[PDB]
């Protein structure tokens, strides 16, 4: 699209409509973009000394990108609630994007006095990496997505990436991608950039919780017909004499019943409690946390494989890195106290996946014989096994929406671990930069790189609309399901509202599983 | 319809489907019908002495009728919840009824031993008073409607009615309707009786609560332009000297602001509190309760005109007869203690209708002058006034569904007072009786009325399906609405479930207003 | 009650705002809400036209009806006019009932 200077390049679309089966969440926000790295690509690396587990090598670019991989960039409390309360599941189908009403300003810091003014002509160029030839950054839970609250103006993030490294230094194989080596489209004012995408058949996120659970799944009333090993030894006057007898598992017997499927896999996490007291006093934050390691650098295992966060009656506990944790609007960056964060809870799964903090089961160790007692041992890490079945990490309104499946020789069940939809070809990276403006050059020629540009930034609005599909409920469940509600009682502030000084804020994390489906 | 003896006259339909705009609740239950008044019509009257406010005269009939004027005869907790959580309103549209698989048994109490057996031939006759020529009983909140819970078998109520009376005695004008003077259709087994109805344009029951309220309705930011009387007298050195000055109502001024509409009407009720303590000790149950009176008999004013049950912070109180009160499954018939009942609460209205227990406003009494102070007085009964606006009593799952608008020269806004839909021509009364079976007659003729019949009753199932329309939500409300949920925490029994001895039970009354619409 | 026409769906609310203008942002990224905008306001004209219907008089009333007139006598200022310093002003409230119909 194209037009004039006194012509709005696009209108403001920010609705949300439900169609019974679909529902489209349109949404627009105003943004701003500075000139990063003063227009140059800069090489960047870990700090020489820095622990090995923390080295790196890569580049930062003068390019800034766009991102809305956060559910709340599309759903509004209320809306989300609608969804989350009457749908067995849902998934994204297609999207449409558009930047417009772009405007380029140029600040002038003459002595003790700045003065911003329109640089009409100068441009901002955009380009979408629709061929995925660029290090996909999104999906890395970074923060600089869209504001949950419309009215909020925002700054565009700067693109940076990482290649290979042998400590703080580069290794040859590492590649250096240059963003100008693409065909950016250049916008001036009166210019807009639209583009549209279509998702790929993915599974509806399961937005329901299970009423039955693996173990308790058969019918009480009837005993099976298969037998199991009831007792081993037997009374012989005073002493026992080994004599194995078997029984037919019934209701009273349950624990012993024969089955057909196994809980999901696991990778044991340390348990910490919301109650300061209980927790051993010391620094096992890193030392005790569950991790894995590549090329000799141990990394953390955050968002561990999807597994319930606490047994019955222990909402007080949680994994050291088995859950998602968001900050309460305002919460500072580092070492903030428990009271400043919102920890997610995944009890809803218990029913199928193991509890993060407790071992999977316990396999037998030795082979018993008359002169040898029967061994056994608990298992803290069980990789996928036939017959296992499980549930993936719920979603949360202010959580990630999707993530790119890495291009590898092999993947195994790609639901992104941080939760979300695992996409092979996700929404392409959208980039934006401000074509430089060489400030006054010298009369006599010089072949040096230009270094003195006009100080200036851009701004303008952006809009994103997405169509989601739904799987409606359908249970013959007689008694009421659970629903997500807002507290009745009076409060000094409404949840998901602007305070007295107009600061919007999300009180709690809102999950997705409320409706109840049987297993 | 018709067929054979070994042929089910109908199947069992008991589903419930939602179509986005409609939703059909089908429902079938098994029933039983005895032979009332041993087959005769009996004249009936108050007990000679009995307080005048309690006299009456009328008849009881050998006929039993059918009734489902209770929302839970169609909605199942869950279902109801669906409705009640995502709909600005709804109303009934049409219905279809069918009796079938009728079966007539005949008990034999030979000495110390009864023995029931099939009287194949004998019949049960049904007939619907589709011309409303019979005293419409339904709508009178009687109890003998359908079981909320399907699996429950039930007994059919007996038809009785009331005419005029001058104390315990009849007055001529009083009519005596005879049920045989209709064309009953006679069913034998293999016979079924279907019939269908269509409702009449009625208003969707408002199933939402108001976010604004009459008083607080204008915009804070701006002061009006109309002036009101700020002060009357004025400082004159030591003494005041009358000097009326006026102000322009603003935010701080609010109470004084000029408006455009008035709260609904009222009829003051006594306030009682759920807290035994507070309540004055004595018997003002009748003496103090709000009532009205015709032909010299004071009757009670139950379900008073629709008006909020308590101001902010007083959920502890309520009208003496301004609310609906249901029994907790089991609760005996008389003088049962507060702990045995469930009292409905209509706070949701506060916003438009007056509070039942507190006066409407206060009008001025006298005309003031120098030598006369300004009078004033509170008003406890305000009949409809121009500009008044209000809300009708909510509904409640186990509440009435509708009621017949009395045939009179004049009605005023017919939403039935007990709540529900006011119908001009409501679902016709359906009646049923068992054609008598003269037990063995004497060889020699006698012209006396037959008095010795075969002892026998009937049974068989009945089905009722109804189509309701809906008005879906549609508010730009950002923050979450309130929804109806079931408690998370463990409990010995699930709500709306059968206990250990299979006794279904409704824990609490469930209203209808949860979703929030602005005023 | 304040008088007027009672409408079920009255003339819809018309709103207007000035899309914000982020004044100069910092070179290094920050995910905070933008708080420094360009100071600016808007202006321009607006127009509203409305069509009203009428019910004309029709009485066999012989003698003159009452009408609303402006005072004959001289005055320092005309009613519904700008004073000496150009300040328009409505002298009195003007009602609507003048013409006389029988009950």
mmCIF file of N, CA and C in Angstrom, chain B residues 239-322:
data_model
loop_
_atom_site.group_PDB
_atom_site.id
_atom_site.type_symbol
_atom_site.label_atom_id
_atom_site.label_comp_id
_atom_site.label_asym_id
_atom_site.label_seq_id
_atom_site.Cartn_x
_atom_site.Cartn_y
_atom_site.Cartn_z
ATOM 1 N N UNK B 239 -25.975 36.465 63.914
ATOM 2 C CA UNK B 239 -27.103 35.704 63.449
ATOM 3 C C UNK B 239 -27.213 35.528 61.936
ATOM 4 N N UNK B 240 -27.826 34.403 61.616
ATOM 5 C CA UNK B 240 -28.122 34.006 60.261
ATOM 6 C C UNK B 240 -29.320 34.842 59.773
ATOM 7 N N UNK B 241 -29.336 35.107 58.484
ATOM 8 C CA UNK B 241 -30.421 35.850 57.892
ATOM 9 C C UNK B 241 -30.688 35.023 56.611
ATOM 10 N N UNK B 242 -31.922 34.528 56.422
ATOM 11 C CA UNK B 242 -32.268 33.705 55.239
ATOM 12 C C UNK B 242 -31.876 34.426 53.925
ATOM 13 N N UNK B 243 -31.120 33.716 53.080
ATOM 14 C CA UNK B 243 -30.616 34.220 51.804
ATOM 15 C C UNK B 243 -30.232 33.009 50.963
ATOM 16 N N UNK B 244 -31.163 32.559 50.131
ATOM 17 C CA UNK B 244 -30.925 31.389 49.305
ATOM 18 C C UNK B 244 -29.974 31.588 48.157
ATOM 19 N N UNK B 245 -28.978 30.732 48.153
ATOM 20 C CA UNK B 245 -27.974 30.760 47.131
ATOM 21 C C UNK B 245 -27.974 29.375 46.503
ATOM 22 N N UNK B 246 -27.636 29.326 45.216
ATOM 23 C CA UNK B 246 -27.614 28.084 44.456
ATOM 24 C C UNK B 246 -26.265 27.677 43.915
ATOM 25 N N UNK B 247 -26.079 26.380 43.709
ATOM 26 C CA UNK B 247 -24.824 25.915 43.160
ATOM 27 C C UNK B 247 -25.037 25.045 41.970
ATOM 28 N N UNK B 248 -23.938 24.755 41.309
ATOM 29 C CA UNK B 248 -23.937 23.927 40.120
ATOM 30 C C UNK B 248 -23.395 22.568 40.482
ATOM 31 N N UNK B 249 -24.260 21.574 40.602
ATOM 32 C CA UNK B 249 -23.801 20.241 41.022
ATOM 33 C C UNK B 249 -22.578 19.681 40.299
ATOM 34 N N UNK B 250 -21.575 19.252 41.055
ATOM 35 C CA UNK B 250 -20.375 18.669 40.467
ATOM 36 C C UNK B 250 -20.153 17.283 41.059
ATOM 37 N N UNK B 251 -18.925 16.791 41.021
ATOM 38 C CA UNK B 251 -18.629 15.451 41.548
ATOM 39 C C UNK B 251 -18.800 15.390 43.085
ATOM 40 N N UNK B 252 -18.131 16.308 43.781
ATOM 41 C CA UNK B 252 -18.191 16.488 45.244
ATOM 42 C C UNK B 252 -19.645 16.695 45.727
ATOM 43 N N UNK B 253 -20.398 17.311 44.841
ATOM 44 C CA UNK B 253 -21.799 17.626 45.037
ATOM 45 C C UNK B 253 -22.754 16.493 44.795
ATOM 46 N N UNK B 254 -22.361 15.588 43.911
ATOM 47 C CA UNK B 254 -23.177 14.434 43.538
ATOM 48 C C UNK B 254 -24.556 14.216 44.136
ATOM 49 N N UNK B 255 -24.614 13.887 45.415
ATOM 50 C CA UNK B 255 -25.917 13.629 45.993
ATOM 51 C C UNK B 255 -26.946 14.629 45.432
ATOM 52 N N UNK B 256 -26.500 15.867 45.234
ATOM 53 C CA UNK B 256 -27.367 16.959 44.801
ATOM 54 C C UNK B 256 -27.632 17.053 43.337
ATOM 55 N N UNK B 257 -26.871 16.298 42.563
ATOM 56 C CA UNK B 257 -27.050 16.340 41.127
ATOM 57 C C UNK B 257 -28.482 16.115 40.623
ATOM 58 N N UNK B 258 -28.796 16.771 39.502
ATOM 59 C CA UNK B 258 -30.096 16.633 38.814
ATOM 60 C C UNK B 258 -30.054 15.364 37.980
ATOM 61 N N UNK B 259 -31.182 14.676 37.889
ATOM 62 C CA UNK B 259 -31.227 13.413 37.164
ATOM 63 C C UNK B 259 -32.351 13.214 36.143
ATOM 64 N N UNK B 260 -32.746 11.984 35.864
ATOM 65 C CA UNK B 260 -33.740 11.837 34.826
ATOM 66 C C UNK B 260 -34.660 10.655 35.051
ATOM 67 N N UNK B 261 -34.348 9.814 36.031
ATOM 68 C CA UNK B 261 -35.166 8.637 36.285
ATOM 69 C C UNK B 261 -35.172 8.263 37.754
ATOM 70 N N UNK B 262 -36.242 7.592 38.177
ATOM 71 C CA UNK B 262 -36.442 7.171 39.563
ATOM 72 C C UNK B 262 -36.401 5.698 39.880
ATOM 73 N N UNK B 263 -35.963 5.351 41.087
ATOM 74 C CA UNK B 263 -35.913 3.941 41.432
ATOM 75 C C UNK B 263 -37.307 3.351 41.289
ATOM 76 N N UNK B 264 -37.318 2.031 41.185
ATOM 77 C CA UNK B 264 -38.529 1.255 41.071
ATOM 78 C C UNK B 264 -39.402 1.566 42.261
ATOM 79 N N UNK B 265 -40.616 1.021 42.301
ATOM 80 C CA UNK B 265 -41.546 1.267 43.400
ATOM 81 C C UNK B 265 -41.189 0.437 44.628
ATOM 82 N N UNK B 266 -41.981 0.575 45.695
ATOM 83 C CA UNK B 266 -41.746 -0.150 46.945
ATOM 84 C C UNK B 266 -42.991 -0.321 47.819
ATOM 85 N N UNK B 267 -42.836 -1.237 48.776
ATOM 86 C CA UNK B 267 -43.844 -1.629 49.772
ATOM 87 C C UNK B 267 -43.145 -2.211 51.021
ATOM 88 N N UNK B 268 -42.521 -1.352 51.819
ATOM 89 C CA UNK B 268 -41.788 -1.722 53.044
ATOM 90 C C UNK B 268 -42.044 -3.049 53.781
ATOM 91 N N UNK B 269 -40.951 -3.751 54.036
ATOM 92 C CA UNK B 269 -40.989 -5.018 54.744
ATOM 93 C C UNK B 269 -40.198 -4.919 56.055
ATOM 94 N N UNK B 270 -40.559 -5.753 57.012
ATOM 95 C CA UNK B 270 -39.787 -5.804 58.228
ATOM 96 C C UNK B 270 -38.438 -6.496 57.994
ATOM 97 N N UNK B 271 -37.431 -6.015 58.697
ATOM 98 C CA UNK B 271 -36.131 -6.611 58.563
ATOM 99 C C UNK B 271 -35.819 -7.611 59.666
ATOM 100 N N UNK B 272 -35.358 -8.778 59.266
ATOM 101 C CA UNK B 272 -34.997 -9.777 60.255
ATOM 102 C C UNK B 272 -33.554 -10.127 59.944
ATOM 103 N N UNK B 273 -32.826 -10.651 60.916
ATOM 104 C CA UNK B 273 -31.451 -10.992 60.624
ATOM 105 C C UNK B 273 -31.158 -12.462 60.861
ATOM 106 N N UNK B 274 -30.297 -12.964 59.988
ATOM 107 C CA UNK B 274 -29.876 -14.341 60.027
ATOM 108 C C UNK B 274 -29.287 -14.567 61.422
ATOM 109 N N UNK B 275 -28.819 -13.509 62.095
ATOM 110 C CA UNK B 275 -28.228 -13.653 63.446
ATOM 111 C C UNK B 275 -29.246 -13.590 64.591
ATOM 112 N N UNK B 276 -29.738 -14.752 65.027
ATOM 113 C CA UNK B 276 -30.735 -14.884 66.127
ATOM 114 C C UNK B 276 -30.752 -13.705 67.104
ATOM 115 N N UNK B 277 -29.577 -13.392 67.645
ATOM 116 C CA UNK B 277 -29.375 -12.285 68.584
ATOM 117 C C UNK B 277 -30.247 -11.052 68.270
ATOM 118 N N UNK B 278 -29.746 -10.190 67.378
ATOM 119 C CA UNK B 278 -30.375 -8.931 66.920
ATOM 120 C C UNK B 278 -31.890 -8.881 66.995
ATOM 121 N N UNK B 279 -32.538 -9.835 66.341
ATOM 122 C CA UNK B 279 -33.997 -9.955 66.321
ATOM 123 C C UNK B 279 -34.788 -9.868 67.635
ATOM 124 N N UNK B 280 -35.634 -8.838 67.706
ATOM 125 C CA UNK B 280 -36.535 -8.640 68.830
ATOM 126 C C UNK B 280 -37.238 -9.990 69.111
ATOM 127 N N UNK B 281 -37.363 -10.259 70.398
ATOM 128 C CA UNK B 281 -37.955 -11.493 70.875
ATOM 129 C C UNK B 281 -39.483 -11.424 71.063
ATOM 130 N N UNK B 282 -40.252 -12.097 70.223
ATOM 131 C CA UNK B 282 -41.704 -12.063 70.369
ATOM 132 C C UNK B 282 -42.330 -12.615 69.121
ATOM 133 N N UNK B 283 -43.647 -12.527 69.042
ATOM 134 C CA UNK B 283 -44.310 -13.033 67.863
ATOM 135 C C UNK B 283 -44.903 -12.003 66.918
ATOM 136 N N UNK B 284 -44.062 -11.500 66.048
ATOM 137 C CA UNK B 284 -44.530 -10.517 65.109
ATOM 138 C C UNK B 284 -44.510 -11.160 63.738
ATOM 139 N N UNK B 285 -44.526 -12.492 63.712
ATOM 140 C CA UNK B 285 -44.470 -13.240 62.450
ATOM 141 C C UNK B 285 -45.623 -12.841 61.592
ATOM 142 N N UNK B 286 -46.803 -12.803 62.192
ATOM 143 C CA UNK B 286 -47.922 -12.360 61.399
ATOM 144 C C UNK B 286 -48.161 -10.894 61.686
ATOM 145 N N UNK B 287 -48.379 -10.580 62.948
ATOM 146 C CA UNK B 287 -48.661 -9.209 63.358
ATOM 147 C C UNK B 287 -47.761 -8.139 62.730
ATOM 148 N N UNK B 288 -46.486 -8.441 62.561
ATOM 149 C CA UNK B 288 -45.627 -7.418 62.004
ATOM 150 C C UNK B 288 -45.337 -7.426 60.515
ATOM 151 N N UNK B 289 -45.699 -8.532 59.846
ATOM 152 C CA UNK B 289 -45.462 -8.741 58.406
ATOM 153 C C UNK B 289 -46.317 -7.923 57.474
ATOM 154 N N UNK B 290 -45.698 -7.480 56.396
ATOM 155 C CA UNK B 290 -46.416 -6.648 55.435
ATOM 156 C C UNK B 290 -47.509 -7.437 54.665
ATOM 157 N N UNK B 291 -48.731 -6.915 54.619
ATOM 158 C CA UNK B 291 -49.834 -7.593 53.939
ATOM 159 C C UNK B 291 -50.803 -6.649 53.192
ATOM 160 N N UNK B 292 -51.851 -7.224 52.617
ATOM 161 C CA UNK B 292 -52.867 -6.432 51.917
ATOM 162 C C UNK B 292 -54.179 -7.106 52.250
ATOM 163 N N UNK B 293 -55.323 -6.531 51.893
ATOM 164 C CA UNK B 293 -56.537 -7.296 52.151
ATOM 165 C C UNK B 293 -57.779 -7.053 51.281
ATOM 166 N N UNK B 294 -58.351 -8.178 50.823
ATOM 167 C CA UNK B 294 -59.580 -8.266 50.007
ATOM 168 C C UNK B 294 -60.724 -8.813 50.842
ATOM 169 N N UNK B 295 -61.915 -8.331 50.517
ATOM 170 C CA UNK B 295 -63.143 -8.735 51.171
ATOM 171 C C UNK B 295 -62.942 -8.991 52.650
ATOM 172 N N UNK B 296 -62.273 -8.064 53.332
ATOM 173 C CA UNK B 296 -62.004 -8.243 54.751
ATOM 174 C C UNK B 296 -61.045 -9.350 55.218
ATOM 175 N N UNK B 297 -60.422 -10.118 54.323
ATOM 176 C CA UNK B 297 -59.436 -11.092 54.806
ATOM 177 C C UNK B 297 -58.060 -10.608 54.389
ATOM 178 N N UNK B 298 -57.256 -10.319 55.401
ATOM 179 C CA UNK B 298 -55.889 -9.891 55.168
ATOM 180 C C UNK B 298 -55.089 -11.100 54.686
ATOM 181 N N UNK B 299 -54.456 -10.999 53.527
ATOM 182 C CA UNK B 299 -53.594 -12.099 53.129
ATOM 183 C C UNK B 299 -52.158 -11.592 53.234
ATOM 184 N N UNK B 300 -51.212 -12.496 53.183
ATOM 185 C CA UNK B 300 -49.823 -12.108 53.268
ATOM 186 C C UNK B 300 -49.243 -11.515 51.993
ATOM 187 N N UNK B 301 -48.182 -10.734 52.049
ATOM 188 C CA UNK B 301 -47.653 -10.255 50.787
ATOM 189 C C UNK B 301 -46.319 -10.935 50.619
ATOM 190 N N UNK B 302 -46.309 -12.181 50.136
ATOM 191 C CA UNK B 302 -45.046 -12.897 49.906
ATOM 192 C C UNK B 302 -44.372 -12.461 48.606
ATOM 193 N N UNK B 303 -43.091 -12.861 48.361
ATOM 194 C CA UNK B 303 -42.468 -12.373 47.133
ATOM 195 C C UNK B 303 -42.997 -10.948 46.952
ATOM 196 N N UNK B 304 -42.609 -10.022 47.825
ATOM 197 C CA UNK B 304 -43.108 -8.658 47.692
ATOM 198 C C UNK B 304 -42.716 -8.101 46.337
ATOM 199 N N UNK B 305 -43.207 -6.919 45.941
ATOM 200 C CA UNK B 305 -42.777 -6.431 44.638
ATOM 201 C C UNK B 305 -41.266 -6.464 44.643
ATOM 202 N N UNK B 306 -40.723 -6.836 43.508
ATOM 203 C CA UNK B 306 -39.295 -6.955 43.379
ATOM 204 C C UNK B 306 -38.453 -5.811 43.965
ATOM 205 N N UNK B 307 -37.768 -6.103 45.062
ATOM 206 C CA UNK B 307 -36.874 -5.106 45.637
ATOM 207 C C UNK B 307 -35.725 -5.680 46.442
ATOM 208 N N UNK B 308 -34.515 -5.236 46.095
ATOM 209 C CA UNK B 308 -33.234 -5.622 46.710
ATOM 210 C C UNK B 308 -33.424 -5.994 48.174
ATOM 211 N N UNK B 309 -32.786 -7.076 48.624
ATOM 212 C CA UNK B 309 -32.915 -7.535 50.010
ATOM 213 C C UNK B 309 -31.992 -6.956 51.126
ATOM 214 N N UNK B 310 -31.012 -6.136 50.790
ATOM 215 C CA UNK B 310 -30.230 -5.517 51.869
ATOM 216 C C UNK B 310 -29.200 -4.570 51.348
ATOM 217 N N UNK B 311 -28.962 -3.487 52.083
ATOM 218 C CA UNK B 311 -27.969 -2.512 51.698
ATOM 219 C C UNK B 311 -26.582 -3.136 51.766
ATOM 220 N N UNK B 312 -25.596 -2.355 51.357
ATOM 221 C CA UNK B 312 -24.198 -2.780 51.352
ATOM 222 C C UNK B 312 -23.860 -3.247 52.735
ATOM 223 N N UNK B 313 -23.078 -4.321 52.839
ATOM 224 C CA UNK B 313 -22.609 -4.853 54.128
ATOM 225 C C UNK B 313 -23.718 -5.418 55.056
ATOM 226 N N UNK B 314 -24.737 -6.088 54.544
ATOM 227 C CA UNK B 314 -25.774 -6.553 55.465
ATOM 228 C C UNK B 314 -26.405 -7.785 54.940
ATOM 229 N N UNK B 315 -25.583 -8.635 54.341
ATOM 230 C CA UNK B 315 -26.095 -9.870 53.759
ATOM 231 C C UNK B 315 -26.807 -10.665 54.824
ATOM 232 N N UNK B 316 -26.571 -10.263 56.075
ATOM 233 C CA UNK B 316 -27.140 -10.859 57.289
ATOM 234 C C UNK B 316 -28.621 -10.600 57.439
ATOM 235 N N UNK B 317 -29.110 -9.565 56.787
ATOM 236 C CA UNK B 317 -30.530 -9.297 56.883
ATOM 237 C C UNK B 317 -31.331 -9.759 55.695
ATOM 238 N N UNK B 318 -32.639 -9.519 55.851
ATOM 239 C CA UNK B 318 -33.682 -9.782 54.875
ATOM 240 C C UNK B 318 -35.131 -9.491 55.256
ATOM 241 N N UNK B 319 -35.965 -9.319 54.228
ATOM 242 C CA UNK B 319 -37.370 -9.035 54.437
ATOM 243 C C UNK B 319 -38.077 -10.198 55.096
ATOM 244 N N UNK B 320 -39.164 -9.859 55.722
ATOM 245 C CA UNK B 320 -39.914 -10.877 56.357
ATOM 246 C C UNK B 320 -40.595 -11.700 55.291
ATOM 247 N N UNK B 321 -40.982 -11.091 54.180
ATOM 248 C CA UNK B 321 -41.657 -11.895 53.173
ATOM 249 C C UNK B 321 -41.235 -11.403 51.798
ATOM 250 N N UNK B 322 -40.096 -10.725 51.753
ATOM 251 C CA UNK B 322 -39.588 -10.194 50.504
ATOM 252 C C UNK B 322 -38.665 -11.128 49.759
#
